[PDB]
Amino acid sequence: PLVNDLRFINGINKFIIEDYATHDFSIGHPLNMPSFIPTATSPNGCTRIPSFSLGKTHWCYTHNVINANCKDHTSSNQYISMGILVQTASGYPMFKTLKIQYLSDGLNRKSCSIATVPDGCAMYCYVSTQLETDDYAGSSPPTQKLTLLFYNDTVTERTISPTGLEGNWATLVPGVGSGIYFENKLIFPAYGGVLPNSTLGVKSAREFFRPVNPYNPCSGPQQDLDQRALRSYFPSYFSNRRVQSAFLVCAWNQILVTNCELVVPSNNQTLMGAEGRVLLINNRLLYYQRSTSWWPYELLYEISFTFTNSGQSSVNMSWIPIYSFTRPGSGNCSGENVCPTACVSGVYLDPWPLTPYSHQSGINRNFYFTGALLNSSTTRVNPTLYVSALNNLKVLAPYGNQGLFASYTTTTCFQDTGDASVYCVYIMELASNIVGEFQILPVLTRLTIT
Amino acid sequence: PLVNDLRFINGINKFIIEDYATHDFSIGHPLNMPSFIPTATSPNGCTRIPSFSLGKTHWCYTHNVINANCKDHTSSNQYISMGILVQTASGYPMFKTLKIQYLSDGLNRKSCSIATVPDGCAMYCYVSTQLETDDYAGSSPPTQKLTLLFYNDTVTERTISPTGLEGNWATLVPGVGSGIYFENKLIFPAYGGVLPNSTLGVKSAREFFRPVNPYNPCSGPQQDLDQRALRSYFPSYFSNRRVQSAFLVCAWNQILVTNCELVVPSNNQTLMGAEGRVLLINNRLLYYQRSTSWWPYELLYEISFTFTNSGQSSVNMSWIPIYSFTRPGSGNCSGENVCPTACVSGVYLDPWPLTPYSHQSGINRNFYFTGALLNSSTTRVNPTLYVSALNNLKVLAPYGNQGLFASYTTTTCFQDTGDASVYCVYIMELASNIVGEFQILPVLTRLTIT
Numbered sequence: 040p041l042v043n044d045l046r047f048i049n050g051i052n053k054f055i056i057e058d059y060a061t062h063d064f065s066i067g068h069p070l071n072m073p074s075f076i077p078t079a080t081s082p083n084g085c086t087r088i089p090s091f092s093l094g095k096t097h098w099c100y101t102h103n104v105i106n107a108n109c110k111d112h113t114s115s116n117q118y119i120s121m122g123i124l125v126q127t128a129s130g131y132p133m134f135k136t137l138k139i140q141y142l143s144d145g146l147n148r149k150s151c152s153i154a155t156v157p158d159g160c161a162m163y164c165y166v167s168t169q170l171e172t173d174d175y176a177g178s179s180p181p182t183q184k185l186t187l188l189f190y191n192d193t194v195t196e197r198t199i200s201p202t203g204l205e206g207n208w209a210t211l212v213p214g215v216g217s218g219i220y221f222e223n224k225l226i227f228p229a230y231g232g233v234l235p236n237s238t239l240g241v242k243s244a245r246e247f248f249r250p251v252n253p254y255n256p257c258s259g260p261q262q263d264l265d266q267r268a269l270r271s272y273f274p275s276y277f278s279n280r281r282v283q284s285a286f287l288v289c290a291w292n293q294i295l296v297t298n299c300e301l302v303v304p305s306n307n308q309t310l311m312g313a314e315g316r317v318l319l320i321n322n323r324l325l326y327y328q329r330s331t332s333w334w335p336y337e338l339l340y341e342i343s344f345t346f347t348n349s350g351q352s353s354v355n356m357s358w359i360p361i362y363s364f365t366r367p368g369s370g371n372c373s374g375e376n377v378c379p380t381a382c383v384s385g386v387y388l389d390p391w392p393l394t395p396y397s398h399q400s401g402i403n404r405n406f407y408f409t410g411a412l413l414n415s416s417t418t419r420v421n422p423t424l425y426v427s428a429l430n431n432l433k434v435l436a437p438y439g440n441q442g443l444f445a446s447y448t449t450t451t452c453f454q455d456t457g458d459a460s461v462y463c464v465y466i467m468e469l470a471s472n473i474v475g476e477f478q479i480l481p482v483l484t485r486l487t488i489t
Numbered sequence: 490p491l492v493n494d495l496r497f498i499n500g501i502n503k504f505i506i507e508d509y510a511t512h513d514f515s516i517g518h519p520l521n522m523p524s525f526i527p528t529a530t531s532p533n534g535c536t537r538i539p540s541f542s543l544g545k546t547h548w549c550y551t552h553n554v555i556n557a558n559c560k561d562h563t564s565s566n567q568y569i570s571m572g573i574l575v576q577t578a579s580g581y582p583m584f585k586t587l588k589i590q591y592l593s594d595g596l597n598r599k600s601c602s603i604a605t606v607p608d609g610c611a612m613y614c615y616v617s618t619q620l621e622t623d624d625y626a627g628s629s630p631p632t633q634k635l636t637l638l639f640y641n642d643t644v645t646e647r648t649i650s651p652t653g654l655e656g657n658w659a660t661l662v663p664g665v666g667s668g669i670y671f672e673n674k675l676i677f678p679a680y681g682g683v684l685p686n687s688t689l690g691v692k693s694a695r696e697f698f699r700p701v702n703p704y705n706p707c708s709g710p711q712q713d714l715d716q717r718a719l720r721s722y723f724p725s726y727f728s729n730r731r732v733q734s735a736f737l738v739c740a741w742n743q744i745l746v747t748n749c750e751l752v753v754p755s756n757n758q759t760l761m762g763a764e765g766r767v768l769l770i771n772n773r774l775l776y777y778q779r780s781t782s783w784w785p786y787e788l789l790y791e792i793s794f795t796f797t798n799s800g801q802s803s804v805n806m807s808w809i810p811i812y813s814f815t816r817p818g819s820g821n822c823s824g825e826n827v828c829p830t831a832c833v834s835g836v837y838l839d840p841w842p843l844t845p846y847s848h849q850s851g852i853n854r855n856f857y858f859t860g861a862l863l864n865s866s867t868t869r870v871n872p873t874l875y876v877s878a879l880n881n882l883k884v885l886a887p888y889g890n891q892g893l894f895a896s897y898t899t900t901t902c903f904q905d906t907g908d909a910s911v912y913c914v915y916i917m918e919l920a921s922n923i924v925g926e927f928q929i930l931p932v933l934t935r936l937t938i939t
């Protein structure tokens with residue numbers, strides 16, 4: 040059966056710490072198992088852009104493979120797998136692959152998000168025919184693809200044109216981080232360029248968000264800072280489109296015929312559009328947003344939807360006030376810049392929240408989250424396992440030596456309800472001496488909480 | 490269905506050059522695909538000892554995994570997979586894993602050899618409770634295990650005591666290299682120590698084999714060199730047992746109840762016992778023998794069996810006169826030593842024969858074989874893809890830079906009958922900077938023959 044070992048099924052997508060109390064952390068050493076993530080078979084072949092979802096009954100995984108240089112494009116292929124958590128005699132679980140699908144048909148599917156769905160996986164891709172910058176310069180979004188891969192080896196792929204895309208967008212691509220399936224809804228992260236003179240572009244022209252770190256403020260008048268923040272949404276790198284995060288939401292019930300819906304947040308509540316991830320913990324939804332724009336700290340929002348009688352839906356989001364570690368960036372968008380600027384920079388590094396933030400009783404200031412960061416303010420280098428509070432890092436554990444190059448990281452934690460062990464898997468693009476750019480490594484760790 | 494793409498089914502286990510003529514070769518660049526061989530998930534965790542068999546309808550693979558250093562031994566786990574050859578849009582096939590079995594029960598299965606069998610894989614292991622030297626010092630062979638893994642997810646394991654084992658052997662272990670299934674027979678490579686005072690020990694006491702390289706002889710008298718060669722079979726490292734190669738042959742018909750049989754070759758025809766591989770190409774059988782003893786060149790024998798009235802079977806082998814490249818070794822067992830001396834050294838590097846040697850018409854002096862060697866006479870370093878004639882190397886293609894550490898290599902070639910493409914997969918243990926000692930890398934290349 041396509042189902043996790045029973046000691047994990049009730050420890051998945053849970054808040055591990057409902058204490059609201061203060062805690063100290065220790066991140067254990069990497070636990071050895073056969074990697075479920077395949078490496079390149081050539082020194083110069085490219086494997087990048089991981090997407091991982093651990094669902095209650097199984098997990099889904101995907102990444103992009105190129106038989107050429109990473110910089111080189113042309114077409115690429117997409118490795119997709121699904122499997123379960125299985126306990127080993129070693130004392131810890133292992134990710135056991137049950138199904139593999141290697142999409143190699145010459146269609147250049149990229150920026151793909153995967154989601155765990157009943158009896159399988161759903162992947163959202165766009166078909167790339169040109170440079171990303173050309174994509175934003177143009178007036179027409181690329182082809183949007185939704186593919187369904189089931190345990191019974193059935194694979195179905197559809198082109199979709201979600202409600203709200205045509206006429207409003209220069210491009211749209213998936214947000215690379217995993218999406219979720221909840222309550223007959225399939226929801227993916229997405230982002231792209233909004234045509235500033237379109238209906239949507241005109242309705243959202245005024246909107247902007249300016250997060251402030253009280254412990255490291257940006258000097259200037261509020262109105263100047265505000266207008267700079269508003270203008271950061273229109274980078275010239277992307278042809279001054281309004282770069283916008285959006286949510287692809289699909290009725291699972293009608294997933295074979297539905298064109299889906301594009302639900303767009305208010306930019307009063309969110310930063311410039313970027314890669315992201317949708318999480319469902321307990322039944323509260325969250326959104327990770329990559330810091331591509333000027334704000335260097337970790338972006339995590341509590342979100343909620345209103346699906347209006349199956350009309351045009353809305354989403355409300357609320358920023359969790361996090362400013363602890365900083366992501367690397369280039370130029371005036373580096374990890375040291377805290378001030379409003381037009382930026383296309385940063386790197387994908389998502390958090391796994393160990394605690395609720397807002398709950399029924401109140402707000403938890405003792406919020407904790409874990410992940411892998413890159414210890415540098417400029418360079419993608421020095422991958423470091425971490426646990427972080429809102430204002431400060433609770434614990435740090437470097438992977439590898441100083442000078443080890445690493446890029447994207449995605450983290451998922453789950454609990455063994457049999458022995459109460461808390462496991463975190465840090466999936467990170469790491470530079471390998473022998474295989475193509477970035478062996479994507481799932482390192483599994485036991486997390487000790489006091 | 491467990492079956493290779495149709496284009497490769499008639500291109501597997503064939504002599505791809507039946508020309509008997511001279512040829513030139515070019516080894517293509519590595520072709521990128523998702524690796525079917527999982528890596529370690531920890532920087533210092535062990536992954537070693539690959540065994541690979543490509544059958545007409547599918548392939549079988551296994552290697553050993555330890556959550557500790559390679560040197561420290563407590564227990565290990567055994568990764569097993571099976572799958573098919575599938576064509577990609579990239580222009581070349583890919584190894585698609587269809588079933589994974591991770592044997593992790595705390596039993597230390599070691600030196601395992603895998604074989605492709607109908608609807609699955611068969612693996613021959615021994616359970617290691619102690620040092621190999623302790624094994625040879627003792628009087629009792631370790632536990633011999635035979636495990637059957639089928640596509641229908643059934644896995645069956647038996648302890649076996651092959652005919653001829655009890656009382657005649659101090660130890661026996663599998664050859665590591667893959668075994669084969671042919672004519673209702675399952676045949677694995679094996680080796681171990683023979684008790685010199687036993688029946689087998691006294692019957693084989695006179696036997697020895699002393700190969701000579703005509704272009705690089707060992708200077709000295711025949712009689713003295715001969716007794717030195719006889720004495721090389723009894724290393725004090727292995728407690729002066731007679732170190733002996735053998736074949737585990739099993740009736741597939743009765744595979745659930747049979748105890749199997751040990752068929753032991755005459756040491757007049759073969760060197761000191763070691764790791765090895767059984768090949769079936771066309772319908773003739775070959776045996777690769779690791780050069781653990783003093784002879785530094787590549788050992789490949791044409792072999793044939795006589796199964797006498799289901800009584801005690803016999804095996805005849807005939808050395809193919811190869812002296813071209815040399816394997817690395819230590820001390821007076823290095824790649825430069827051509828003279829009989831007690832050695833326990835060398836490394837596993839198996840050849841794939843592209844041409845028949847002996848045929849009905851005669852013997853092919855234009856014999857060619859391909860594989861991966863280590864360019865050093867002392868150190869396991871500088872992995873190099875090669876095609877070799879009997880006396881000389883036809884072509885060389887280094888993997889990586891100078892100083893790259895590599896150990897065991899196993900090579901398999903097959904032909905696409907659709908476009909006549911010849912593919913060779915060189916599976917090698919390579920030192921990785923991020924994962925535990927020995928990312929086992931399957932590098933696939935197209936071989937050009939003129």
Ligand SMILES: CC(=O)N[C@H]1[C@H]([C@H](O)[C@H](O)CO)O[C@@](O[C@H]2[C@@H](O)[C@@H](CO)O[C@@H](O[C@H]3[C@H](O)[C@@H](O)[C@@H](O)O[C@@H]3CO)[C@@H]2O)(C(=O)O)C[C@@H]1O
Binds near residue numbers: 150331384386387
């Ligand atoms: C659809 C897509 O291309 N996604 C890529 C993302 C997006 O570009 C990002 O979310 C912005 O929308 O980013 C990734 O690609 C970056 C990577 O190739 C690096 C290589 O070092 O370059 C980035 O472009 C840089 C460029 O290298 C600089 O010279 C300068 O011009 O700025 C641009 C933009 O920062 C790529 O965006 C990524 O790895 O970060 C991955 C996706 O392929």
Ligand SMILES: CC(=O)N[C@H]1[C@H]([C@H](O)[C@H](O)CO)O[C@@](O[C@H]2[C@@H](O)[C@@H](CO)O[C@@H](O[C@H]3[C@H](O)[C@@H](O)[C@@H](O)O[C@@H]3CO)[C@@H]2O)(C(=O)O)C[C@@H]1O
Binds near residue numbers: 662764781834835836
């Ligand atoms: C059942 C088993 O132990 N198989 C191992 C084989 C066998 O030892 C070999 O076929 C001889 O029968 O060899 C491999 O292990 C060797 C490896 O661990 C190296 C490490 O560098 O050491 C070898 O033992 C050396 C020893 O290190 C030296 O100090 C000296 O005493 O000589 C001995 C023998 O050369 C191990 O044999 C191997 O990797 O080659 C693999 C199997 O674990």
Ligand SMILES: *[C@@H]1O[C@H](CO)[C@@H](O)[C@H](O)[C@H]1NC(C)=O
Binds near residue numbers: 178235236237
């Ligand atoms: C208006 O939108 C179109 C896309 O149809 C775009 O080409 C044009 O440059 C936009 N003008 C401005 C000011 O954004």
Ligand SMILES: *[C@@H]1O[C@H](CO)[C@@H](O)[C@H](O)[C@H]1NC(C)=O
Binds near residue numbers: 158189191193
């Ligand atoms: C495979 O599974 C999906 C589950 O939704 C089902 O809809 C589909 O009919 C199945 N296909 C086959 C051939 O069984």
Ligand SMILES: *[C@@H]1O[C@H](CO)[C@@H](O)[C@H](O)[C@H]1NC(C)=O
Binds near residue numbers: 245
């Ligand atoms: C966003 O905020 C601006 C002022 O900063 C305001 O003009 C606009 O009405 C707001 N829009 C929404 C949806 O809140």
Ligand SMILES: *[C@@H]1O[C@H](CO)[C@@H](O)[C@H](O)[C@H]1NC(C)=O
Binds near residue numbers: 308355356357358
């Ligand atoms: C939406 O989120 C904002 C925080 O950005 C919060 O103040 C507001 O109450 C939420 N709106 C609704 C209708 O819940």
Ligand SMILES: *[C@@H]1O[C@H](CO)[C@@H](O)[C@H](O)[C@H]1NC(C)=O
Binds near residue numbers: 364423441
């Ligand atoms: C980065 O590295 C330095 C030492 O190289 C260390 O002192 C510092 O704390 C690290 N920072 C983080 C966020 O890990």
Ligand SMILES: *[C@@H]1O[C@H](CO)[C@@H](O)[C@H](O)[C@H]1NC(C)=O
Binds near residue numbers: 729
């Ligand atoms: C003789 O054989 C016995 C078992 O029959 C064994 O214990 C012993 O090791 C052998 N002696 C030598 C010198 O090999």
Ligand SMILES: *[C@@H]1O[C@H](CO)[C@@H](O)[C@H](O)[C@H]1NC(C)=O
Binds near residue numbers: 639
């Ligand atoms: C699996 O296959 C083997 C032979 O291929 C067969 O003997 C065995 O009965 C099968 N197991 C099950 C549960 O059907």
Ligand SMILES: *[C@@H]1O[C@H](CO)[C@@H](O)[C@H](O)[C@H]1NC(C)=O
Binds near residue numbers: 695696697755757
């Ligand atoms: C092996 O050769 C020896 C002499 O070296 C001879 O006495 C013996 O008869 C031969 N045995 C076999 C099986 O060939």
Ligand SMILES: *[C@@H]1O[C@H](CO)[C@@H](O)[C@H](O)[C@H]1NC(C)=O
Binds near residue numbers: 758805806807808
């Ligand atoms: C066995 O192989 C030998 C070569 O070592 C060869 O001379 C002979 O033909 C074979 N013996 C038999 C009985 O076929």
Ligand SMILES: *[C@@H]1O[C@H](CO)[C@@H](O)[C@H](O)[C@H]1NC(C)=O
Binds near residue numbers: 864891
């Ligand atoms: C070993 O390396 C040297 C270059 O350092 C090269 O000239 C030589 O041909 C190589 N030998 C083999 C067998 O690859």
